[PDB]
Ligand binder design. Sequence first.
Ligand SMILES: *Cc1c(COP(=O)(O)O)cnc(C)c1O
Ligand SMILES: *Cc1c(COP(=O)(O)O)cnc(C)c1O
Ligand SMILES: CC(C)CCC(=O)O
Ligand SMILES: CC(C)CCC(=O)O
Ligand SMILES: [Mg+2]
Lengths: 358, 358
Amino acid sequence: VGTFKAKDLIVTPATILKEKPDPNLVFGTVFTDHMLTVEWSSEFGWEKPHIKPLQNLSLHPGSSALHYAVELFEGLKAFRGVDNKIRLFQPNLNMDRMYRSAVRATLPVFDKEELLECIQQLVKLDQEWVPYSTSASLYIRPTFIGTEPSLGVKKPTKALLFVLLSPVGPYFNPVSLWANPKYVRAWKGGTGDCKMGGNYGSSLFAQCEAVDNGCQQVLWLYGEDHQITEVGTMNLFLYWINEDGEEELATPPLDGIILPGVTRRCILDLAHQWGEFKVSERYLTMDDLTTALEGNRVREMFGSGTACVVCPVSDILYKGETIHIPTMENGPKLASRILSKLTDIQYGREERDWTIVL
Amino acid sequence: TFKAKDLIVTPATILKEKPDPNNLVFGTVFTDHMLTVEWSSEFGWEKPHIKPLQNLSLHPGSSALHYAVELFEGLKAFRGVDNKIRLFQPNLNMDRMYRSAVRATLPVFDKEELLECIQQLVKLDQEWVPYSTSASLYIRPTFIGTEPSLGVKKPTKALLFVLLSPVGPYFFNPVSLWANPKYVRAWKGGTGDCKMGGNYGSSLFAQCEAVDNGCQQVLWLYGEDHQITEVGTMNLFLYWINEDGEEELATPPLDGIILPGVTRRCILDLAHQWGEFKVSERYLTMDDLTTALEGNRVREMFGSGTACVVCPVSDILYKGETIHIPTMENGPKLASRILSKLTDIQYGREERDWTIVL
Ligand SMILES: *Cc1c(COP(=O)(O)O)cnc(C)c1O
Ligand SMILES: *Cc1c(COP(=O)(O)O)cnc(C)c1O
Ligand SMILES: CC(C)CCC(=O)O
Ligand SMILES: CC(C)CCC(=O)O
Ligand SMILES: [Mg+2]
């Protein structure tokens, strides 16, 4: 057990540099000039990290990442502030999650501080890619795959940790959800609370069926009571008047089937800080939703995540019936306020312990 | 769809020497060649290639590394007692690979063309099909999404390849199982009924946990009543006297959480034709099992799968106790009869339409 170290970084600058794209971009379509890569073996442990020109990965055909999904990823952003200072948002939480995911994937552990510094060195080198727009940013995709060259299903004796950079804009423009309870995203005892690739490949069929019915995303339902868990790849928030006639900002609890998002945490922290209404991490079902609608109790519904931050939901297609959510007709007040707060913090218009600057 | 007729063959310059068919570690040795077929949304399938075993050059953003957009298959080639090389139920593998491709939203292919391409790959490396009646050539068709963009969606790029690995045993050597209801392999509304990469990477944590407890495999439990579903990566079979006091061979039903193994189907077929006892596809819980043991009603328990046609079970670690299974004390009579029959068919000692020559 050990870790690679940032002070050991081997930088190899690309001679040919690619022209930056126009800030006004399709998510994950464009990649920067460089990338970070770190090899690992159970025999020699972590090798020295490298920052080199973006290039293809040369992988053995038997690599466990291609056969048994031994893999995991992360997603954070770097923002060019109104002061032109590049900032990262709550990077330390992504490193924690990534570490936890590694352990649950049986991939080799590493030192969070070192990885973060290596990332900071990667972004710094390609800092000119960080968009020159207050509505765009640079997406950081840390990835960790098993490269064991054997078909035996088991803990990998070889692995590759790498990091890609992609300048992006959007991932309000409300979305419509497709809710089919026949499809299940995560289960108790599963890995839904980790960012392991295995939990995503199996959702593509559902996502396709969603676009097949005019929806932009999938509303993941769970259990006999059809609990509302997540919106596609985002955590779900419901701003309504609860059963007790109280103004409430609710979101499903972290009971195993919900991925603990960094945006989810922040929203809950801002929501608690303001102390203007009740904040509850509890169970929400379709019936709770419908009963509330046929009472004008609902105010806003939206998804949260690094890619969208705040993503208003306006309709849910459930049991052949299109269920409209008055999110947009009520502002969206909270959703907008939350967007401004996070955006202000991310672009340096507001000082806070949530961002770091190199 | 690609066509076998279009195969482009690039034979290796230097051929590796064959391993000892007596000391083979499952899936660690690979033959001289592999099959590769590139797919693109814009152009469709490229022509198929049989070229020397080399590393795959993939864009670091390939969806197979990020979102487990991948699936695999497993079938074997056997050198018969007449020295004729045979494939066992290969068309069933093609059908399962095809259905899984659809569920993963990977591109469809002509099942016969793939099989012919595989036969031609095996024909080229035919000398790798071990001169042994206790060894064979494992065939690993693999289908991965190579989509460069980081968006979670249906791939517009993909690769289909086939590797070959001479093998002997996956590990009668009875195995002990580690049963802990805290982990769930697959769930209703899930994808556990497909050979999609995502279902395995999530198992490693439980698997390594079984090892540090002396067990070679995990006994996958499901639900409040703790149904016993599969033995590691193999289907589960129970030979006992049931509640009604009847002699019976039972195996969990295909209700969505069980992978329809080819071996499993074959065993049910053989058991059905012998018609010497009741054959049931039914639920089985730890309680039925432990209650049956206390009643001395259990005879044999074993896992089945291409890697280990019949893998007898001797012990189960559950609730801190070690539940002994009398399988080996009972012969294992049925386990042997079945193993003997399947191998007699595979190695041509018996003719049946379950094997395809060359
Ligand atoms: C990444 C992800 C989220 C959001 O987490 P953030 O850290 O806020 O980006 C939510 N749900 C799923 C399933 C995710 O993969
Ligand atoms: C492949 C597999 C089996 C066995 O099926 P065969 O087609 O008979 O090899 C059983 N269970 C799981 C989970 C599998 O992946
Ligand atoms: C799953 C990732 C491609 C996007 C996560 C998000 O920010 O919602
Ligand atoms: C999962 C694979 C490595 C083995 C499947 C089997 O033969 O049971
Ligand atoms: Mg044809």
